[PDB]
Design an enzyme around this catalytic site. Structure first.
Site, short mmCIF file in Angstrom:
data_model
loop_
_atom_site.label_atom_id
_atom_site.label_comp_id
_atom_site.label_asym_id
_atom_site.label_seq_id
_atom_site.Cartn_x
_atom_site.Cartn_y
_atom_site.Cartn_z
N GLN A 65 74.86 -74.84 -68.80
CA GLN A 65 75.87 -74.89 -67.76
C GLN A 65 76.09 -73.48 -67.24
O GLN A 65 76.45 -72.60 -68.00
CB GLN A 65 77.17 -75.51 -68.27
CG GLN A 65 78.13 -75.74 -67.11
CD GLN A 65 79.54 -76.14 -67.47
OE1 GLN A 65 80.24 -75.42 -68.18
NE2 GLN A 65 79.99 -77.30 -66.94
N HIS A 70 78.21 -75.41 -62.58
CA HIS A 70 79.62 -75.66 -62.87
C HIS A 70 80.43 -75.64 -61.57
O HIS A 70 80.91 -74.59 -61.12
CB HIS A 70 80.17 -74.63 -63.81
CG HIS A 70 81.45 -75.05 -64.46
ND1 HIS A 70 82.30 -75.99 -63.90
CD2 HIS A 70 81.99 -74.70 -65.64
CE1 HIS A 70 83.31 -76.17 -64.73
NE2 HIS A 70 83.15 -75.40 -65.79
N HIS A 88 86.68 -77.74 -62.37
CA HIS A 88 87.71 -77.11 -63.20
C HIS A 88 88.30 -75.83 -62.64
O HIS A 88 88.80 -74.99 -63.38
CB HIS A 88 87.21 -76.88 -64.63
CG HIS A 88 86.85 -78.15 -65.34
ND1 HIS A 88 86.08 -78.15 -66.48
CD2 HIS A 88 87.12 -79.45 -65.06
CE1 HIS A 88 85.92 -79.40 -66.89
NE2 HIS A 88 86.54 -80.21 -66.05
N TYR A 140 86.84 -73.27 -61.18
CA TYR A 140 86.01 -72.08 -61.18
C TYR A 140 85.45 -71.82 -59.76
O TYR A 140 85.90 -72.45 -58.80
CB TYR A 140 84.98 -72.13 -62.33
CG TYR A 140 85.71 -72.17 -63.65
CD1 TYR A 140 86.48 -71.10 -64.07
CD2 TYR A 140 85.70 -73.31 -64.45
CE1 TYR A 140 87.18 -71.14 -65.25
CE2 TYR A 140 86.41 -73.37 -65.61
CZ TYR A 140 87.16 -72.29 -66.02
OH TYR A 140 87.85 -72.40 -67.21
N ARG A 178 78.17 -80.46 -62.32
CA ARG A 178 79.44 -81.00 -62.79
C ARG A 178 80.53 -80.77 -61.75
O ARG A 178 80.70 -79.66 -61.25
CB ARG A 178 79.87 -80.39 -64.12
CG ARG A 178 80.87 -81.26 -64.84
CD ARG A 178 81.27 -80.78 -66.21
NE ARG A 178 81.68 -81.92 -67.03
CZ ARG A 178 82.40 -81.84 -68.14
NH1 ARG A 178 83.01 -80.73 -68.51
NH2 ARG A 178 82.55 -82.92 -68.88
N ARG A 188 85.32 -83.03 -77.43
CA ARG A 188 85.94 -82.76 -78.73
C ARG A 188 85.27 -83.51 -79.88
O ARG A 188 85.12 -82.95 -80.97
CB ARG A 188 87.43 -83.02 -78.67
CG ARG A 188 88.15 -82.01 -77.77
CD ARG A 188 89.54 -82.46 -77.40
NE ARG A 188 89.51 -83.53 -76.43
CZ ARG A 188 90.58 -84.12 -75.91
NH1 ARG A 188 91.79 -83.75 -76.29
NH2 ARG A 188 90.44 -85.08 -75.01
C1 LIG Z 1 87.26 -76.23 -76.38
C2 LIG Z 1 86.80 -76.83 -75.08
C3 LIG Z 1 85.94 -76.11 -74.26
C4 LIG Z 1 85.50 -76.64 -73.05
N1 LIG Z 1 84.60 -75.91 -72.33
C5 LIG Z 1 84.11 -76.45 -71.19
C6 LIG Z 1 83.08 -75.78 -70.48
O1 LIG Z 1 82.54 -74.72 -70.90
N2 LIG Z 1 82.64 -76.36 -69.33
C7 LIG Z 1 83.17 -77.53 -68.86
O2 LIG Z 1 82.71 -78.00 -67.79
N3 LIG Z 1 84.13 -78.19 -69.53
C8 LIG Z 1 84.59 -77.67 -70.69
N4 LIG Z 1 85.49 -78.36 -71.41
C9 LIG Z 1 85.83 -79.73 -71.00
C10 LIG Z 1 85.02 -80.72 -71.82
O3 LIG Z 1 83.65 -80.70 -71.40
C11 LIG Z 1 85.53 -82.14 -71.67
O4 LIG Z 1 85.52 -82.50 -70.29
C12 LIG Z 1 86.94 -82.34 -72.22
O5 LIG Z 1 86.99 -81.84 -73.57
C13 LIG Z 1 87.34 -83.81 -72.17
O6 LIG Z 1 86.38 -84.65 -72.83
P1 LIG Z 1 86.65 -85.17 -74.36
O7 LIG Z 1 87.86 -86.07 -74.24
O8 LIG Z 1 85.37 -85.90 -74.72
O9 LIG Z 1 86.89 -83.95 -75.25
C14 LIG Z 1 85.92 -77.89 -72.60
C15 LIG Z 1 86.81 -78.60 -73.45
C16 LIG Z 1 87.24 -78.07 -74.67
C17 LIG Z 1 88.20 -78.87 -75.53
O1 LIG Z 2 90.69 -76.90 -73.81
N1 LIG Z 2 89.93 -77.30 -72.67
O2 LIG Z 2 90.02 -78.61 -72.17
C1 LIG Z 2 89.13 -76.44 -72.09
C2 LIG Z 2 88.38 -76.77 -70.96
C3 LIG Z 2 87.50 -75.87 -70.36
C4 LIG Z 2 87.24 -74.61 -70.90
C5 LIG Z 2 86.34 -73.74 -70.30
C6 LIG Z 2 85.66 -74.14 -69.16
C7 LIG Z 2 85.90 -75.40 -68.62
O3 LIG Z 2 85.22 -75.81 -67.53
C8 LIG Z 2 86.80 -76.26 -69.22
O1 LIG Z 3 89.59 -76.11 -67.29
N1 LIG Z 3 90.52 -75.53 -68.17
O2 LIG Z 3 91.85 -75.92 -68.04
C1 LIG Z 3 90.15 -74.62 -69.06
C2 LIG Z 3 91.04 -74.04 -69.96
C3 LIG Z 3 90.71 -73.10 -70.95
C4 LIG Z 3 89.53 -72.37 -70.93
C5 LIG Z 3 89.25 -71.46 -71.95
C6 LIG Z 3 90.14 -71.26 -72.98
C7 LIG Z 3 91.33 -71.98 -73.01
O3 LIG Z 3 92.21 -71.78 -74.02
C8 LIG Z 3 91.61 -72.89 -72.00
#
Ligand SMILES: Cc1cc2nc3c(=O)[nH]c(=O)nc-3n(C[C@H](O)[C@H](O)[C@H](O)COP(=O)(O)O)c2cc1C
Ligand SMILES: O=[N+]([O-])/C=C/c1cccc(O)c1
Ligand SMILES: O=[N+]([O-])/C=C/c1cccc(O)c1
Length: 363
Positions: free
Chosen positions: A99, A180, A183, A185, A232, A323
Site C-alpha cells: 500500500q 492509498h 482515509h 490522506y 483503496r 484487527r
Molecule cells: C492499527 C491499525 C492500522 C491501520 N493502518 C491502516 C493502513 O496503513 N492503511 C489503511 O488503508 N487502513 C489502515 N487501517 C484500517 C484497516 O485496514 C481496517 O480498515 C480497519 O481496521 C477496519 O477493519 P477491521 O474491522 O477488519 O479491523 C488500520 C487499522 C488499524 C486498527
Molecule cells: O486505528 N485505526 O483504525 C487506524 C487506521 C489507519 C491508520 C493508518 C492509516 C490508515 O489509512 C488507517
Molecule cells: O484513518 N485514521 O483515522 C487513522 C488513524 C490513526 C493512524 C495512525 C495512528 C493512530 O493512532 C491513528
C-alpha cells in the site's frame, strides 16, 4: 456453501482464498531512514496463508511521510530491506501487495524534509493528530501541522513520485500495489470538497477533484501493468475528519466508472472506521458492481458471515480483515475451522517491538 476458501484471480495473481489481510500501520520501522526490518518480515511471513497480504501504508517519498515509524519505498536501503521481506513471504507461498501513500496534511513539520509544512490540496489543517516518536522512540500522538497548498507546477512531481514508488515496488518483489486513496490522506484530500478548496483544474468539479488520482492510476499502469494495480477508497461517510461532500454517491460512481476504464486489478472499499456508522445500501453496492469489472474487496468490521453473504450475492469478491489479522496469523485456518480468535491487545497496535506484533500464536 462457503466461498471464502475458494480461489480468486486478482489481476496478475491468483489468491487461493478470499480472506485478505488489510493494510495495517504498525509504526515499527527504523529511523533514521524509515527502513523496514526483519521483525516486520517475520510478522508478514506469519500471515502468508492470507489470500493476499496488503502491507502497511508505505511512503512514496520522504515528503510523503506523516508518521514516525512508517516505512518508505523511495530509498535504496528501503528497497533492499523490502526485497528480503517479500522474499520471505514468497518462501511461504504467499502474495503481498504494497500500500503506497502520501500522507499530505496528516503529518507534522518536524518529520518533513527541511522541517517544513506538509503539503495538501489546500492550506487547511486536518484538525486531527498524527503519530510521532518521543525521545525514547515510543509512539506519541501530536496535532497535525497546517499544510501548504501544492502549486500547480508541483503536481507532476507527485504523480512521478507514485510512478517511481511503483517501479521500486516491482523491483522489491511485491506482487501488486495498492494506491492509498482513502482515509483523508493526500489523494483523498484532493477528492473531497471538504479538504479541497482549489479553484484550478485540480479542484471544484468532481472531474477536477478526481484528476490527480486518475493521473496517478494512469502513470502506475503505464509503469507496470493495469493488472498489478489496486486502489483503496473510503468514498462514503467521514474518515479522519474528511467527509466525501454533498454528492458522495454520485461522485463515488464517477470515480469508479473512470477506474473501470483502466482495467485495474481491484477496487478496495473501506466502508467504515472503527467507530462505525451507516452501512452501504444494497443499491449502492449494485451500482458499484455494474460499473467495475475487476475484483471488489470489502472492508470494515466484517465478519466471515457478512463476507459470505455479500460474496454469495455477487456484490464483492473478497474481504479484508484488519484487527483480526493483527491478532491471528492463521486467520484463514481459524475461519475455515470455526475456531476462536486470539484476544486482541490494542495497546501494542502502534510502535514498540515484537510484543503484540509477532507473539500472537497460531492454532
Ligand atoms: C492499527 C491499525 C492500522 C491501520 N493502518 C491502516 C493502513 O496503513 N492503511 C489503511 O488503508 N487502513 C489502515 N487501517 C484500517 C484497516 O485496514 C481496517 O480498515 C480497519 O481496521 C477496519 O477493519 P477491521 O474491522 O477488519 O479491523 C488500520 C487499522 C488499524 C486498527
Ligand atoms: O486505528 N485505526 O483504525 C487506524 C487506521 C489507519 C491508520 C493508518 C492509516 C490508515 O489509512 C488507517
Ligand atoms: O484513518 N485514521 O483515522 C487513522 C488513524 C490513526 C493512524 C495512525 C495512528 C493512530 O493512532 C491513528
Amino acid at each position: 456453501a462457503e466461498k471464502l476458501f475458494t480461489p480468486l484471480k486478482v489481476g496478475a495473481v491468483t489468491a487461493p482464498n478470499r480472506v485478505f489481510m488489510a493494510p495495517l500501520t504498525r509504526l515499527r520501522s527504523i529511523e533514521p531512514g524509515d527502513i523496514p526490518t526483519p521483525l516486520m518480515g517475520e510478522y508478514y511471513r506469519q500471515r502468508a496463508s492470507a489470500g493476499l497480504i496488503i502491507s502497511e501504508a508505505t511512503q512514496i517519498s520522504a515528503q510523503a511521510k506523516g508518521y514516525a515509524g512508517a516505512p518508505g519505498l523511495h530509498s535504496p536501503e528501503q528497497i533492499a530491506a523490502w526485497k528480503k521481506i517479500t522474499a520471505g513471504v514468497h518462501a511461504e507461498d504467499g502474495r503481498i501487495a504494497v500500500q503506497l501513500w502520501h500522507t499530505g496534511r496528516i503529518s507534522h513539520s518536524s518529520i518533513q524534509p527541511g522541517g517544513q509544512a506538509p503539503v495538501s490540496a489546500s492550506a487547511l489543517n486536518a484538525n486531527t493528530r498524527t503519530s510521532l516518536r518521543d525521545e525514547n522512540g515510543n509512539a506519541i500522538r501530536v496535532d497535525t501541522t497546517t499544510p501548504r497548498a501544492l502549486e500547480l507546477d508541483e503536481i507532476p512531481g507527485i504523480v512521478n513520485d507514485f510512478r517511481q514508488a511503483v517501479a521500486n515496488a516491482r523491483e522489491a518483489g511485491f506482487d501488486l500495489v495498492e494506491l492509498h486513496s482513502a482515509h483523508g490522506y493526500l489523494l483523498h484530500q484532493f477528492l473531497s470538497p471538504s479538504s479541497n478548496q482549489r479553484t484550478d483544474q485540480y479542484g471544484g468539479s468532481v472531474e477536477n477533484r478526481a484528476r490527480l488520482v486518475l493521473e496517478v492510476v494512469d502513470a502506475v499502469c503505464n509503469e507496470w501493468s493495469a493488472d498489478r494495480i489496486g486502489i483503496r477508497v473510503s468514498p462514503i461517510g467521514t474518515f479522519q475528519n474528511v467527509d466525501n461532500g454533498p454528492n458522495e454517491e454520485a461522485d463515488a460512481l464517477y470515480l469508479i466508472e473512470e477506474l473501470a476504464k483502466r482495467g485495474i486489478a481491484y477496487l478496495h472499499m473501506s466502508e467504515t472506521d472503527l467507530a462505525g456508522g451507516k452501512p452501504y445500501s444494497e443499491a449502492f453496492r449494485q451500482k458499484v458492481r455494474e460499473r467495475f469489472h475487476g475484483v471488489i474487496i470489502g472492508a470494515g468490521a466484517y465478519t466471515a458471515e457478512k463476507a459470505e453473504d455479500l460474496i454469495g450475492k455477487g456484490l464483492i469478491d473478497a474481504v479484508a480483515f484488519g484487527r483480526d489479522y493483527i491478532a491471528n496469523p492463521d486467520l484463514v485456518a481459524r475461519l475455515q475451522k470455526k475456531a476462536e480468535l486470539n484476544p486482541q491487545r490494542p495497546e501494542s497496535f502502534y510502535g514498540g517491538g515484537a510484543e503484540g506484533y509477532t507473539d500472537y500464536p497460531s492454532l
